[PDB]
Design a binder for this molecule. Structure first.
Ligand code: GD4
Lengths: 256, 260
């Protein structure tokens, strides 16, 4: 019944709010919004990063130090997503090796998804939204690194064209984690039974929440392919990056 | 209204029977055994193959290369049919002309491997209008580069075939593929994207009437549009290996053009 999907929907939004500090509705204000409640330090020069890097609350060559920090968050979101996943009804009851797998692979698609929420066409928010690093600056970086985030900007700008909100992404995010075609799973029926349930709940969500936006649920699913390619070809930089910087205890934190 | 979509569902099925002579319904009857009039000749090793040329017509220099140029000739004949089918898609011929070409350049191969599964099972694939059948094992067993071309298509086919789509559904899905905004180099994307909402609308309603028990098949089907791109990519690159280990073997120009 609809009452049950609407239930599971509210459920997942709630976990989404608890598990994820910086929400999209929150970041949208902080971004180009007109609210003067605060003003993120903008990073645009080389002469503004190191001037910001003194006054900010960062926890850590420049083209490399910039990369490493985008890796500090990846290791953070990995935890936020994991905690969110545990609240997805049935996820903890799956076989445990299977949970690790679903998360091993979904993490990289969940990250770029919610990164699109901190992104507009000119840059991206940083450090809980206390920063905005311009896209023009990120292109300007040493050749192994200059096209690091350019694909994610390009993809974000399309994904945001959909005008999803946090209530939409919550159910969307969940569908990714339950992909059920990940390498190496062992009991696949329950993963799919859950995904079907979430995919149902997504469909009713966008229909209730964007009745004018027609066939939006169908457009959203094909953005999941756009993601699987972003991640495919993001690994191809992440391998070639192991052909530049060439820590022991740190490499263990960041390994893969 | 419902009925507008069911009319568009019928129109595309009708173009589909007329544009493709090897439907999934023909393929599935040859493969099963519903007959003794349409049984195929099976090519399980080299020695079969020289006999199959006696008993079937293949207008075909070594074996891995002639089998491969075999796939080329068929590919070219495949593009010609999809180009024909595309022309029947309401609105497609009304687009900007440089865009028709673009949608076709990028869509033609996602579609080939889609309807290739119609002709595949776990054990092999139908060749020559269904007159033959080449074991997956034989295809894995060809010379170092070529014995890998068919395998991911076999892999995609076994998952895809599991959806149990018939021709009435595939006709709509093929047309959802062609009309894609996401194609690089497209001039005016809104009129394309507007068509596809309607094609998608049709596919959603079609997949529900034709497959009620099968929950979320529309969703599930839209997902496998990911696996196609991954097979095109894997091909394009492995196709570049051949053209430089094999600088004597040629490439049909149509294929050559639609391959940037
Ligand atoms: C003689 C013959 C063969 C050998 C045959 C097929 C037919 C119809 C034949 O008549 C079809 C299945 C098939 C396994 C070919 O299936 C493929 C079709 C396309 C492709 C990709 C090619 S490669 C390229 O550069 N562009 C393509 O379409 C690979 C396998 O082998």
């Amino acid at each position: 019944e609809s009452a049950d999907l609407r239930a599971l929907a509210k459920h997942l939004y709630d976990s989404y709010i608890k598990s994820f500090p910086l929400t999209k509705a929150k970041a949208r204000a902080i971004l180009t919004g007109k609210t003067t409640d605060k003003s993120p330090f903008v990073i645009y020069d080389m002469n503004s990063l190191m001037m910001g890097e003194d006054k900010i609350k960062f926890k850590h060559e420049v083209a490399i130090r910039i990369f490493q920090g985008c890796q500090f968050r990846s290791v953070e979101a990995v935890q936020e997503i994991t905690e969110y996943a545990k609240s997805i009804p049935g996820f903890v009851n799956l076989d445990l090796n299977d949970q690790v797998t679903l998360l091993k692979y979904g993490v990289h698609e969940i990250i770029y998804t919610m990164l699109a929420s901190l992104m507009n066409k000119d840059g991206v928010l940083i450090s809980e939204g206390q920063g905005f690093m311009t896209r023009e600056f990120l292109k300007s970086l040493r050749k192994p690194f200059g096209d690091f985030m350019e694909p994610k900007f390009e993809f974000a700008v399309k994904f945001n064209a959909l005008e999803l909100d946090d209530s939409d992404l919550a159910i969307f995010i969940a569908v990714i984690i339950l992909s059920g075609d990940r390498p190496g799973l062992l009991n696949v029926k329950p993963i799919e039974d859950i995904q079907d349930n979430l995919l149902q709940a997504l469909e009713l969500q966008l229909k209730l929440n964007h009745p004018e936006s027609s066939q939006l649920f169908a457009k959203l699913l094909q953005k999941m392919t756009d993601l699987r390619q972003i991640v495919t070809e993001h690994v191809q930089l992440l391998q070639v990056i192991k052909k530049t910087e060439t820590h022991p205890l740190l490499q263990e934190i960041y390994k893969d």
